[PDB]
Design a protein around this nucleic acid. Structure first.
Ligand code: MN
Ligand code: MN
Ligand code: MN
Ligand code: MN
Ligand code: MN
Ligand code: MN
Ligand code: ZN
Ligand code: ZN
Lengths: 366, 163, 366, 163
DNA sequence: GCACGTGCTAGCACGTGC
DNA sequence: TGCGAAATTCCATGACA
DNA sequence: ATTGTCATGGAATTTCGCA
DNA sequence: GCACGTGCTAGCACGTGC
DNA sequence: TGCGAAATTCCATGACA
DNA sequence: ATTGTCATGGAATTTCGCA
């Protein structure tokens, strides 16, 4: 009853409107409002009340306000409700987000063949010839692809395959996901010896390896079609699949990967002859004209309710593998650096620096 | 008539025996006739078995119109005959005791024979490990007659391993 | 060389344009076209050629046409390409669809409490007190919900729970998914004795039980928040969760489920008193005014590339649980009856009648 | 003053002992004072233990302002005292040897006592199974004084089990 | 040696057939 | 230049994780 | 410390054969 | 008794810490 | 009727499967 | 023979206190 005494005396207090009659009854200070008569508790009591009505079900803004509304009234009640919701640790770490991620970037295509290799593992598959996994290697510019059968997705097996591959040429960058065979020390020491730079996707985000992941689909599709009504023995089909895909038209490019790598068809079925009367040199100059004039898509329009990150903003990381009835979000953290409008470095909950995709972040509410 | 191109004709032949490097004794030399580009696959025999095995690996990448080779056993067998016809490969043979390729291939084949024998001096016991280094070397070695490297004629680009 | 003889003589054949010179060379009949010179094979040879170029990689319309284009030309080549694609069994059963499902129906809300019960099981959960599952029962109109802890999701345990529930009232319809405890003979014989009608969702389609499935979320959320930083012993929290949710505002309704069931708040915290001076009869008449004037949403606008089903159309069912490298779609079947623009009865691959949601169907292409 | 309502006051009392039906001997009668609505929970004892157990089930549905009951042991213990205060329930007791409820409850309580004893004639050994049928019966039985059923006064709707 | 972090697909339960 | 048919391009969807 | 992709088939538009 | 159909969540592999 | 602040409603997103 | 839902918090609009 601090300033509540003043209002009872008829004095004016900024916020509470004057066309309403405020009184005293049963010890408590009330007000006569359209809905009915409501209690006006002192400011000291107000924090406690909002917490008692939230903790009923951990309700959000509107559901909380309606509870308190049944008994009480005061100015800007919601100001005090969101005040508690911003601090109640359990709600912030269990609640889902209602904000979309900003729209995808489409990175420029690598310019020349052998600039960027994208790699990734497939499986475990039905055992064929004692082989279980397939290491898949896609060249960025062409889309050309090599397939290797391994008995495990180890660094050891990944070494031996790239060794046979690299005899043809050596790439500038190799891009992988943070899979354990690809982040080993032994594998980095292998990249160092050959002068190749290693590049890693942000964790729990396969989109980033989308080039090789997309090629895995084409590989499973054709494998499947060729094993219909027959035991699933894939081993001896890998070289057939490698060849068919390498020579198959991307309809929006008008070219096959074989064509973007060599500029001329080999002795495969239905071969393009169109550049028949040209010397090699007139072909090779044409290939460079095509290679710089390929189709490339533009980033899509944002969602009407997306968010995009900023230095010093409060964000929370998606818990990688939460157990049942456990929260899906980590405690809040601060954005240190914004690498692009979809990639970010945070000071995590360890607290180390971590590089994450915004698809595993959410803006902290309030 | 029409200009020579890659994948038009590959030349192939066996080198060995050699010192027991990691359990192998021979090498299968493959050289594209217009590019001089070169693949090397080690084997434990100059047999038809080892030829198809290696060449399956190669022809799952690209496929030649023609193969040329001496009348060594492995190429003249009827097993290798039926392999070349399955895939649409026309076969060509030199005449006995008078080897014939071209200017470009005769020289390349020579170097391979020389660079190979050189590591058979410097690191003479374990050669199996050193092949990929050799192939890179041979495919980035500049040609006197034309003004580009096999790597350059094949991919229409520079290399990341200049030599 | 049937009608190809005529064209060589200069006669006109409907389809092939006359401003081009067609000749004979190396035994085959060619044509001189802008792109270059192309072979025109006899109609007898044409089916074989389109199949040879498809079987390279099982390519679709455009990728196939471009192969054949390198060597051949004839009128309406694509007519012959889609002809093969409509019949090639492997492509039809492995390929993905590019057509969206028609837009959802929002069924009218049940009118009075106890018209429709929606049920469903939760778990297995972390063992608490030797209890593993939770049977969840939601009343359509109110949203009111009862929770029961069971040691398994059996008919036996489902019997015993609904028996304690039904003492309060008996519902008209009980709606479940086709889960094995709910489709047992023993359970149907239980429904029969009490005069309740049983109703079943279409299989592999949880949306249909969306009312109870949505309530499972609210149940896990609050359970989670209340077990933060503490061992996950839920058993003794079930009655607390049942109560809090039953009395929590749906913001777009302005009411709690307790309120839509009884019309007045009991002795729970922050109780609504607003109808204090009314007799019971003035309350109960008000409750019916509210119950008929609740919010209800309208079906969303279709996708620009959706499909909606028709009797006698060719469709294919999504294989429920395909093994690896096996096709994801069943052989084509015919639509017998269209129950609503999102529900359909087919003569399947057994061939029995089956009732499916259009979300597990795709229009057969071609 | 203000009109009587549901959840305003519940009346509770024990019936038994009875024949050993499925291992139980008693029944806890709960009756809302304005609706006459009725819950019946069987027990194996007229103890404080069995009362809280049952009533926890009931008060996880709705919660009364007041409980009324005789001065039987179970209700006057200080254990049941602390249970009623945790949940905000005010307690009320009749005076010893002079039972008091209302017109409406005295009669309802009577029927329950009569319908119960009747199945104790017709199906006199196994009564545990028959309770839910009785509760439905009692909650759909029409009241003379008011012109609706307890089910009707509680949910503002008809029943699907008319009696 | 065993838990952790990152990458993947298996497997259990229930009620009903043969 | 203008018309109808044919060829060629547009682009939402869905699977790879 | 980094970033989605592209085969696919009905729809929508462009071109083309002819006069 | 064991495979099937419908409903659910577990679990294995690899390379590196302590 | 008209103004700025406050209260109240609008509605995309995401999890339940 | 059947069919998505609704809590949530910034944005967008409506109402309200005052003169
Ligand atoms: Mn991977
Ligand atoms: Mn020889
Ligand atoms: Mn279920
Ligand atoms: Mn008594
Ligand atoms: Mn992958
Ligand atoms: Mn469920
Ligand atoms: Zn909270
Ligand atoms: Zn096909």
């Amino acid at each position: 009853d601090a300033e509540l005494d003043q209002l009872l005396q008829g004095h004016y207090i900024k916020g509470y409107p004057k066309q309403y009659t405020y009184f005293l009854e049963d010890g408590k200070v009330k007000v006569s409002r359209p809905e009915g008569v409501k209690i006006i508790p002192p400011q000291s009591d107000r924090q406690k009340i909002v917490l008692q009505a939230h903790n009923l079900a951990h309700t959000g803004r509107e559901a909380t306000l309606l509870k308190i509304a049944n008994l009480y009234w005061w100015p800007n009640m919601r100001k005090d409700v969101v005040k508690q919701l911003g601090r109640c640790q359990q709600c912030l770490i269990t609640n889902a987000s209602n904000k979309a991620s900003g729209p995808i970037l489409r990175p420029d295509r690598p310019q020349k063949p052998f600039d960027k290799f994208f790699i990734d593992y497939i499986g475990p598959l039905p055992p064929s010839q004692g082989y279980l996994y397939v290491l898949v290697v896609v060249d960025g510019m062409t889309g050309f692809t090599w397939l290797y059968p391994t008995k495990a997705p180890s660094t050891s097996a990944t070494v031996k395959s790239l060794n046979v591959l690299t005899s043809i040429a050596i790439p500038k960058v190799i891009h992988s996901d943070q899979g354990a065979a690809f982040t080993s020390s032994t594998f980095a020491e292998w990249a160092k010896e050959r002068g190749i730079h290693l590049e890693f996707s942000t964790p729990y985000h396969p989109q980033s390896s989308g080039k090789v992941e997309r090629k895995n689909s084409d590989i499973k599709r054709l494998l499947t079609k060729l094993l219909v009504g027959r035991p699933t023995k894939w081993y001896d089909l890998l070289p057939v699949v490698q060849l068919a895909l390498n020579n198959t038209y991307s309809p929006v490019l008008k070219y096959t990967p074989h064509q973007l790598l060599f500029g001329i068809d080999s002795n495969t079925p239905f071969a393009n002859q169109d550049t028949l009367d040209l010397t090699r040199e007139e072909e090779l100059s044409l290939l460079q004209e095509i290679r710089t004039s390929l189709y490339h898509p533009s980033t899509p329009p944002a969602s009407s309710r997306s968010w995009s990150p900023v230095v010093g903003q409060l964000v929370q990381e998606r818990v990688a593998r939460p157990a049942s009835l456990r929260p899906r979000w980590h405690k809040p953290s601060t954005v240190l650096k914004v690498l692009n409008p979809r990639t970010v470095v945070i000071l995590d909950h360890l607290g180390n620096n971590r590089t994450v995709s915004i698809d595993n972040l959410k803006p902290t509410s309030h | 008539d029409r200009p020579q191109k890659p994948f038009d004709k590959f030349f192939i032949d066996y080198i060995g025996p050699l010192p027991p490097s990691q359990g192998y004794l021979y090498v299968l030399v493959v050289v594209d006739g217009m590019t001089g580009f070169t693949w090397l696959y080690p084997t434990k025999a100059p047999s038809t078995s080892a030829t198809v095995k290696s060449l399956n690996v190669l022809t799952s990448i690209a496929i030649p119109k023609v193969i040329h080779s001496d009348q060594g056993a492995a190429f003249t067998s009827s097993t290798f005959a039926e392999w070349a016809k399955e895939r649409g490969i026309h076969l060509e043979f030199s005449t006995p005791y008078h080897p014939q390729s071209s200017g470009k291939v005769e020289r390349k084949n020579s170097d391979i024979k020389r660079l190979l024998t050189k590591l058979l001096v410097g690191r003479p016991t374990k050669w199996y490990d050193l092949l990929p280094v050799v192939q890179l070397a041979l495919n980035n070695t500049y040609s006197p007659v034309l003004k580009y490297t096999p790597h350059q004629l094949l991919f229409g680009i520079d290399s990341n391993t200049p030599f």
